Amino acid sequence: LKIEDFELHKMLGKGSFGKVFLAEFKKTNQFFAIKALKKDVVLMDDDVECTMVEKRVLSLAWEHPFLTHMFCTFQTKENLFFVMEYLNGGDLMYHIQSCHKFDLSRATFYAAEIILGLQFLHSKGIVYRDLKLDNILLDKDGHIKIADFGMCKENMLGDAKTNEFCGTPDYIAPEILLGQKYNHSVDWWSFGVLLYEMLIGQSPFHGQDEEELFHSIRMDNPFYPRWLEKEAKDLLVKLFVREPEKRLGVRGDIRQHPLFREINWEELERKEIDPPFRPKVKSPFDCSNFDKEFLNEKPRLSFADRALINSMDQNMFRNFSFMNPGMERLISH
Amino acid sequence: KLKIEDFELHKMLGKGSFGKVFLAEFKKTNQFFAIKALKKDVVLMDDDVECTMVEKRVLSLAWEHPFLTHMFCTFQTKENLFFVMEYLNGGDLMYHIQSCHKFDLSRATFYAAEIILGLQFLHSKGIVYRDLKLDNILLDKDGHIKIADFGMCKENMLGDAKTNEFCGTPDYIAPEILLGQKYNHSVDWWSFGVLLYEMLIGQSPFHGQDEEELFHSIRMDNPFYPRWLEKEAKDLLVKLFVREPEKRLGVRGDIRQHPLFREINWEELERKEIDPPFRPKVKSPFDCSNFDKNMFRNFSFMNPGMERL
């Protein structure tokens, strides 16, 4: 399989994560989102291990209804490709910029579906570490899909901990900022930050530079407006406990919190509770719910630093190729 | 303490007056770097002992700033001097000027803004740069500028301190240097004017068939500005090409408040939040090859960034 077998119609986004294209396989009317990376960029950014972690985690994640599904991965001399399911609902950052903040029932629904996704990852010994609004995609019906697993730590079951400094600044837990060894607790602090931003429409911690922001994360009390529902406030107070072992998600049973009192968790996992927000989606190949800056730009793969790629060790991305049983059936035919 | 055996020299990127630049990989980590290599006997012949030490001392201070070339570590063998640098494959600005003749106003404004930040950092640290030019500005893979080659710097230039040695690349040298005057950071702002003029117009502001005529033009001729040039770009260049240093913009006034940099948020620029308007298409526009083959005391140094790796 090669990229020439796909027709790259539009570019949905670019950035540090690479380039994401709306791709159609041949002329089968079967659409996909292809994340296309350049090997030389990956090497200079020191994202070799991060790329392999993303492949491995997406190999676990095809079961779970609220993690992004990967159909196949493959590589050329210059390129690394992930062929994903195309989720044209739009990400939560895109939707929250428009409406400023989410209503209580919508934020609760998203919070509940994210809990199922995170608890699945944690059960497999995976700590996610990069939970944020623009890493949560919506599908055509409005169910959440957690995305971007390159920042994960695997093999975290049992009495296991890790210590490396990573994540997005607004969402970084204080235990990471203080240089402590940590476990899945870091995801639940980030979850609280995400939930706060959905409900309140701004971040709970602030600063003019990173130093003030990290001080705020370590020291400052989150602000709860008078209009905020009390059970929403309670959950956030139980999530913003700086002692990791006393934080909800690590301690207690987060599903039994009164915020999710109307939520049947078995029904939610089976996709049987209707999302309070259904995105506008005309077709399976619609591009309405994406920033228009990228869409208008012509889809293309960059050139590569030939001196770097020729001098590179080829076996860095060994065992990168993957393919589920569905893709083999829709290739040979 | 690091050694050359810890690296593996893969391919040669450049060769000339700045020694030889090699693309090198670290032994176990597979982390790629640019290594600049100088022969000691060659450096002693050219009388650039002090120049090499000034480069090391400036590159030690310059690890913090985003638009200066980052040096990870320096070390020496019996015959060679090595600077372990971050690998910057975007290409130098002389290459990109030669590609498209001139940069448009947005591209020229962006590069001019990032150069102002880099220069003003050096000036606040007591470093007058003195060799600003297109081929000493490297781009990273994203498109951000990186000021390189600090061998011609002068240290301890804080407050009313001055120096008097004749130096710089002919097209860019200030009148006060040509007039043999005791000068300060003002010389960088003249050179900035020349570099900015070349980006917008695609030719040098001062001309001559030899140095004698070129230096006369620098001292006497006012530069030509075409009709199509934007009035704000012209205005900044006119204020930059003042021949009395004290009246020059950069020395006098605040260069960041000029109408050319109207849309530029200076803090967001310095944090690298504003994306470059030009990403390089060609990757590593440099000539590539196979590999083949006590005045320098206190040359060894290692930045705390390298200590992590």
Ligand SMILES: Cc1cc2c(cc1NC1CNC1)N1C(=NNC(=O)[C@H]1C)CO2
């Ligand atoms: C910008 C962007 C657009 C995308 C998608 C992702 C992004 N950007 C990433 C950065 N965080 C979301 N995806 C989509 N579907 N499925 C996926 O797995 C990914 C490739 C839809 O389009």
Ligand SMILES: Cc1cc2c(cc1NC1CNC1)N1C(=NNC(=O)[C@H]1C)CO2
């Ligand atoms: C010709 C040349 C090639 C280079 C580099 C420099 C040059 N030439 C110099 C002359 N002005 C740029 N560098 C690079 N990365 N970082 C650096 O500091 C230097 C060593 C990449 O390759």
Ligand code: NA
């Ligand atoms: Na504060």
